[model samples]
Target chain A: GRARDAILDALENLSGDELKKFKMKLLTVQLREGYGRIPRGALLQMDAIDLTDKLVSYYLESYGLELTMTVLRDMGLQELAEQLQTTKE
Target chain B: GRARDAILDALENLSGDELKKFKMKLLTVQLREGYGRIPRGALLQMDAIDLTDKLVSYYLESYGLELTMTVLRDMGLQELAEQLQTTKE
Candidate 1:
């Protein structure tokens, strides 16, 4: 199964300080990417409508919710974060 | 408890056309986020390394691998994509 311990082994790269920075930038990228998609008004004034889960959720499934949950799950909310993922299966 | 079936309910918020675009942006964001992290040479010439798994993989678990694999899984490489995920164990 570990076809590339070599792959992992070959690339045990990056520094602790460096990787943490990278992951955070990616989280922000995930946030901004999804946030940018929804019409500005859709995000700013969502209380008056119902189109996010139906439409936005699909996109979030990729850019928004997926990464957020991963970030969350790892941040000590493993139970709650994993719940969002359960819906995927 | 699905406390927020309400969550998904009030937010079916994207159009099929729109969500697809956002997801692609996110995929690119995922690529850029990780690609930006590695040293220029490590990325441009990983043939001479053995430090990605131990170091870089941990960072990718959140920003890099998690999203990349999810995107891959959805794109129809479910089995192969899921394998990268298992090492999360």
Candidate 2:
């Protein structure tokens, strides 16, 4: 739950353009068939909070938090990823 | 791809009521917070063939075929699960 909150906080830190990049980069992140990412339709409907919520839920159900952090870093959001790293424990 | 094809074939055999049951059972199948499932919104939009496609893609990337068969059986589609077993190779 804390991790979810932290991720939501980090997403809130994003500018509108950064958030756009975040959504785009989420799809292109390394995963087979883009399975760990939110579905395109669902992702499009979400603002930052919902994206964080679903993404965290999906990753926890499948890939765990590792891929989640990686996608943020892949989007050049390493600061946010690093923040999550602390929340990881 | 053969597995995907077989799953689609099996889903196509279901009547509309069975298909509805399939969707409902899919959400209720055992998982940590329903993570491996197609999102409810996405699931609602899918016909059987589309569901088979997304479910196969999602499972292959995350939980693999074992969980797929399990979900089918959970839906009381043991016949379909057994059919998939032949395609498992």
Candidate 3:
């Protein structure tokens, strides 16, 4: 929960190339942390929609999906929240 | 969704110190990304309790608290999950 909030706070205001770069960097980090083997093509396939989907899923698993999605939607990440909500349901 | 999920995955294996470092790094980045004005002592105050509380709160708002907490606690963040569950109701 702390981890998700911290990362989101870090990511909230990023835009343009910075946001994209941050997403990629995070994806790489996630790849290592999660799969323990970064997929070579993952970053190359950077898409906010896809990335957000994966990230939400990962964080939800760690902190509790129900509360995570509720909070995310409340914070204005409607699209991402929706994606997570549907995927989870 | 992908964002929260990715960060949780990254944090899973970190030790207390490593987690602290990561939280600080994330706090710095978050300062740059979200507030656009970094606080002076934010990172120095990186306690898991505070950080986790903030992170879970932030991401939950964005992705939907209900779903996020469900996934987070289900994934093993029982402590945080409990916190959120209690906070929401």
Candidate with the greatest DockQ versus the true structure: 3
Clashing pairs in 2: none
Candidate 1: stretches off by over 4 Å: A1-36, A48-51, A54-65, A71-78, B1-89
> Against the true structure, what is every candidate's RMSD?
21.0, 13.5, 17.0
Ten contiguous residues minimizing lDDT sum, candidate 1 chain B: B2-11
Candidate 2 C-alpha lDDT tens digits along A1-89: 56666667766866686688778777776675544445788777787776766776666633556777666655432345666688776
lDDT value for model 1: 0.39
- Residue-wise lDDT of candidate 1 within A52-81, one digit each (tens)? 232323343344345545555454454545
User: Which window of ten consecutive residues has the lowest lDDT sum in model 3 chain B?
Assistant: B29-38
In the order shown, the candidates' DockQ scores are 0.03, 0.01, 0.03
Best by lDDT: 2
Error of 1 at B17 (Å): 15
Candidate 1 chain A, which ten residues in sequence have the lowest lDDT sum? A3-12
TM-score of every model versus the real structure: 0.24, 0.47, 0.25
A8-88 per-residue lDDT for model 3 (tens digits): 543454466655555445443322222223244665675655554445543445443454455444445656666555545
Tell me how large the interface RMSD of candidate 3 is.
6.6
Candidate 1 per-residue lDDT over residues B33-64, each given as its tens digit: 33544443443333212333423443544554
Q: For chain B alone, what TM-score does every candidate structure achieve against the true structure?
A: 0.33, 0.75, 0.36
Q: DockQ of candidate 3? A: 0.03
